[PDB]
RNA sequence: GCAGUCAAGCGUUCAUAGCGACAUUGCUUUUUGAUUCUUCGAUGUCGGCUCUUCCUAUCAUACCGAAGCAGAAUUCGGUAAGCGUUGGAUUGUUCACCCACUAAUAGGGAACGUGAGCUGGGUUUAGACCGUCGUGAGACAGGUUAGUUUUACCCUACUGAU
RNA sequence: AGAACUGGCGAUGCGGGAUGAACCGAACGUAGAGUUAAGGUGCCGGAAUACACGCUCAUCAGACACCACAAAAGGUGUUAG
């Protein structure tokens, strides 16, 4: 089911991760929204499943 | 590997108690060092009742069964306890049988009566038991 | 830097009438009526004609001006909500256990139930907000459609259905099972 | 003792899932030193027992984020001290070390909490023994054995009662 | 812990720093009136909830020398360059 799998991927897989507080972020985000890390710009992509 | 639950029974065998060996494994007595599933409270000794699984060491018997820790199951209790039908009952002595962690008996025969609570909880004990209560 | 004057424009169709007084906005259209309370922004509405309405901020900073464009978007959404409406489509995604979704009535409250999510015995209930109608589309397998006049009511109702089907204690990249919004559009 | 910054490298490929050299910035007063301000017309000195409360740098339990998270198991991180954190062999022990149960057997403070609350095994009066040292009297942060633990009726605090 | 020059405390009250041997102001017979120092003028508290141009919103804001603490490193928070 490639069409349905892609639909569920954009909500569960296509995300960014803050390197300081592990927050789940939009893929195109430049800064983290959390105040605990001071809105840091150090972000990494969310690792894909294998 | 208990096959169900058990309504609470009065405890009469704290750590350090010695009970007779009710099977034909070659052991003569069992020395209780721990009780499975016991709670924690400062200064309170872990205690066991009928149908409980304990960790025990053989003090008298075949030398191959001595100087080691093995599980055991209590099958008779001298301390009186009340059943849910309103009966207070007790046995003449305290006795147990050597078993593995899964509940299988090391021996193959049981001498003397066996409590009903123990037989229902452990199917292997019930198979090798002659008279229940 | 305290800009002297910032201005935005709001367009009104032929069949829509707008009444604004004391930051209370009521929009009446062919599909119904909507009302919004905006007494937290300090803006000034002015009427140019029957087809144009302007909203302005005087001597406003960067943060205050940023809220002026938000007012225009909220009012515009109300205008199209009573003219075209909003239609949100969602799809059921599962690997092994089928998902059964049905509408039930509980003390006259119009709930919607989700059954057999990952084989769970628990029943999940989601309230249906007023003004939101739920239908199950034909000739498309495992699709639920939400419609209404208020975009916020439709969007939040759909969002509640999505969050109620989140997987716990599992790898979400592997267990891609749930109900997800797949299309946002207008009823017309 | 605890926590950051930088990132050469480790991680099959891939600096930062999890780690991280060469350097560098801090925090803590549960280590030990440095100092000698308070007390020598005396603030009872080790540990355990008993009992209350507090801190969070969270072992377990509730809800979550991340992974080199398929499942199971585990690892890193967040909000959180609400609620728990034990039974034994040897040792005076703090500490340490094993046995075992357990959801878990987390770390600390309160005059290194707590002797008109106890106990007195240890240290640290006088008796005595041994080894080394000293001509000797005697010495030893070396070992060994025996050695009195006093008072509340006052004020306050607290618990109950008029 | 130990030296150099000066000013102090000790031997010293008084106004100010909430509180303090050493800081700030000022040194003292008994009284009256006037004016000030350092420090202050929302209320406690005597005295402008005075005037003027800006900056700052903090789910642990900040608030005055000695003085009763905070750093490296960061933020598309906001402001100016
Ligand atoms: Mg000195
Ligand atoms: Mg005293
Ligand atoms: Mg005394
Ligand atoms: Mg003490
Ligand atoms: Mg005493
Ligand atoms: Mg005392
Ligand atoms: Mg006393
Ligand atoms: Mg003694
Ligand atoms: Mg002596
Ligand atoms: Mg005595
Ligand atoms: Mg003198
Ligand atoms: Mg002060
Ligand atoms: Mg006044
Ligand atoms: Zn972050």
Structural domains of chain C, ranges and CATH numbers in brackets:
1-85 (3.90.930.12), 86-188 (3.90.930.12)
Q: Which domain holds residue B22?
A: 12-133
Distance D34 C1' – B17 CA (angstroms): 58
Tokens of B112: 């003397």
**Contact check, Cβ <8 Å, A8/C176:** yes
CB B43 within 8 A of CB B120: no
Contact residues for C79 (Cβ-Cβ < 8 A; gap 6+)? C10, C11, C12, C13, C16, C18, C27, C29
Residue B4 lies in a domain: no
Chain A touched by C102 (CB under 8 Å) = no
CATH number at residue B78: 2.40.150.20
In order of A11, A16, C101, C183, C184, the CA distances from C91 in angstroms are 13, 24, 11, 9, 12
Tell me how far apart the alpha carbons of residues C160 and C164 are, in angstroms, rounded to a whole number: 6
Q: Where are the alpha helices (DSSP H) in B1-133?
A: 116-121, 123-128
Residue B112 lies in a domain: yes
Which of C93, C118, C175, C182 to probe the A interface (max A CBs under 10 A)? C93
Closest among C50, C47, C68 to C59, alpha carbons compared: C68
Q: How many CB atoms lie within 10 A of CB B44?
A: 10
Chains B and C touch (3+ CB pairs under 8 A): no
Nucleotide nearest to A39 in CA–C1' terms = E75
In order of B8, C89, C98, C109, C135, the CA distances from C103 in angstroms are 47, 16, 17, 11, 9
In order of B72, B98, B116, B119, C43, the CA distances from B130 in angstroms are 19, 17, 12, 11, 92
Structural biology method used: cryo-EM
CB C104 within 8 A of CB C111: yes
Tell me how far apart the alpha carbons of residues B25 and C25 are, in angstroms, rounded to a whole number: 90
**Continuous segment of H or E residues that includes residue C107:** none
CB C15 within 8 A of CB C29: yes
Residue B6 lies in a domain: no
Tell me how far apart the alpha carbons of residues C167 and C73 are, in angstroms, rounded to a whole number: 35
Identify the sign of the CA torsion A35, A40, A41, A42. Answer: negative
E strands, A1-48, where?
16-18, 24-25, 43-45
Residue B80 lies in a domain: yes
Residue B7 lies in a domain: no
Chains C and A touch (3+ CB pairs under 8 A): yes
Task: Provide Rg for chain B, Cα atoms.
Answer: 14
Tokens of C171: 């790898």
CB A5 within 8 A of CB C175: no
E strands, C12-121, where?
17-21, 24-29, 32-37, 44-49, 52-60, 86-93, 100-104, 111-115
CB crowding C3-25: b at 16 or more within 10 Å, else e = eeebebebebeeebebebeebeb
Residue B78 lies in a domain: yes
Distance E42 C1' – C43 CA (angstroms): 33
The C-alpha angle with vertex C88 and arms to C112 and C52, in degrees rounded to 5, equals 130
In order of B3, B31, B96, B129, the CA distances from B39 in angstroms are 21, 20, 22, 30
**% helix, strand, coil for chain A, step of 5:** 20, 15, 60
A40 touches strand E (CB under 7 A): yes
> Residues of C from 108 to 167 whose C-beta is within 7 A of strand D: which are they?
166
Chain A touched by C46 (CB under 8 Å) = no
Please give the distance, rounded to the nearest whole angstrom, from the Cα atom of residue C19 to the centre of ligand 8: 97
Distance in Å, alpha carbon of A4 to nearest chain C alpha carbon: 6
Residue C29: phi, psi to the nearest 5?
-135, -175
Chain A touched by C19 (CB under 8 Å) = no
Distance in Å, alpha carbon of A24 to nearest chain C alpha carbon: 13
Nucleotide nearest to B39 in CA–C1' terms = D102
Q: Resolution in A for the shown PDB structure?
A: 2.2
> Residues of A from 11 to 30 whose C-beta is within 7 A of strand E: which are they?
30
Distance in Å, alpha carbon of A36 to nearest chain C alpha carbon: 22
3-state secondary structure of B126: helix
Please give the distance, rounded to the nearest whole angstrom, from the Cα atom of residue C188 to the centre of ligand 11: 101
Q: Where are the alpha helices (DSSP H) in chain C?
A: 62-81, 151-163
CB B99 within 8 A of CB B73: yes
Please give the distance, rounded to the nearest whole angstrom, from the Cα atom of residue B42 to the centre of ligand 5: 27
Closest among B13, B10, B8, B52 to B32, alpha carbons compared: B13
Tell me how far apart the alpha carbons of residues C159 and C136 are, in angstroms, rounded to a whole number: 17
Strands B53-58 and B70-76, by their bridges, are antiparallel
Domain count, chain B: 1
Strands B95-98 and B18-21, by their bridges, are parallel
Tokens of B52: 């409980």
Residue B59 lies in a domain: yes
Tell me how far apart the alpha carbons of residues C100 and C178 are, in angstroms, rounded to a whole number: 11
Closest among C79, C4, C6 to C43, alpha carbons compared: C6
CB C143 within 8 A of CB C91: yes
Tokens of C170: 């599992």
**Continuous segment of H or E residues that includes residue B88:** strand B88-89
3-state secondary structure of B102: coil
Q: Which nucleotides of E are covered by protein (CB under 7 A)?
A: 55, 59, 74-80
Closest among C134, C130, C91 to C109, alpha carbons compared: C130
Break sites following residues in chain A (C–N > 2.5 A): none
Residue B88 lies in a domain: yes
């Amino acid at each position: 089911e490639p069409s349905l799998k892609a639909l569920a991927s954009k909500y569960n897989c296509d995300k960014s991760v803050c390197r300081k507080c592990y927050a789940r972020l939009p893929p195109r985000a430049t800064n983290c929204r959390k105040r605990k890390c001071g809105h840091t710009n150090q972000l990494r992509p969310k690792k894909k499943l294998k | 590997g208990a096959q169900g639950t058990k309504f609470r029974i009065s405890l009469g065998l704290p750590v350090g108690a010695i009970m007779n060996c009710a099977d034909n494994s070659g052991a003569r007595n069992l020395y209780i060092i721990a009780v499975k599933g016991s709670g924690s409270r400062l200064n309170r000794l872990p205690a066991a009742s009928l149908g409980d699984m304990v960790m025990a060491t053989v003090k008298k018997g075949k030398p191959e069964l001595r100087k080691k820790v093995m599980p055991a199951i209590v099958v008779r209790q001298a301390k009186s306890w009340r059943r849910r039908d309103g009966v207070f009952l007790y046995f003449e002595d305290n006795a147990g049988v050597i078993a593995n962690p899964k509940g299988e008996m090391k021996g193959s025969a049981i001498t003397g009566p066996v409590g009903k609570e123990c037989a229902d909880l452990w199917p292997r004990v019930a198979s090798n038991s002659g008279v229940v209560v | 830097m305290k800009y002297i004057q910032t201005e935005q424009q709001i367009e009104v169709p032929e069949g829509v009438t707008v009444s604004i007084k004391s930051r209370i906005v009521k929009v009446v259209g062919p599909r119904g009526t909507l009302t919004k309370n905006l007494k937290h922004i300090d803006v000034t509405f002015t009427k140019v004609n029957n087809q144009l309405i302007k909203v302005a901020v005087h001597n406003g900073g960067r943060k205050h001006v940023a809220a002026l464009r938000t007012v225009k978007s909220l009012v515009d959404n109300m205008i199209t909500g009573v003219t075209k409406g909003y239609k949100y489509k969602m799809r059921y995604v599962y690997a092994h256990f089928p998902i059964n979704v049905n509408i039930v009535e509980k003390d006259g409250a119009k709930f919607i139930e989700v059954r057999n999510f990952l084989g769970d015995k628990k029943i999940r209930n989601v309230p249906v907000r007023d003004g939101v109608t739920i239908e199950f589309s034909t000739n498309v397998k495992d699709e639920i459609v939400l419609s209404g006049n208020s975009v916020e009511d439709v969007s939040q109702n759909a969002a509640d259905l999505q969050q109620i089907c989140r997987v716990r204690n599992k790898d979400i990249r592997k267990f891609l099972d749930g109900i997800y919004v797949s299309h946002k559009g207008f009823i017309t």
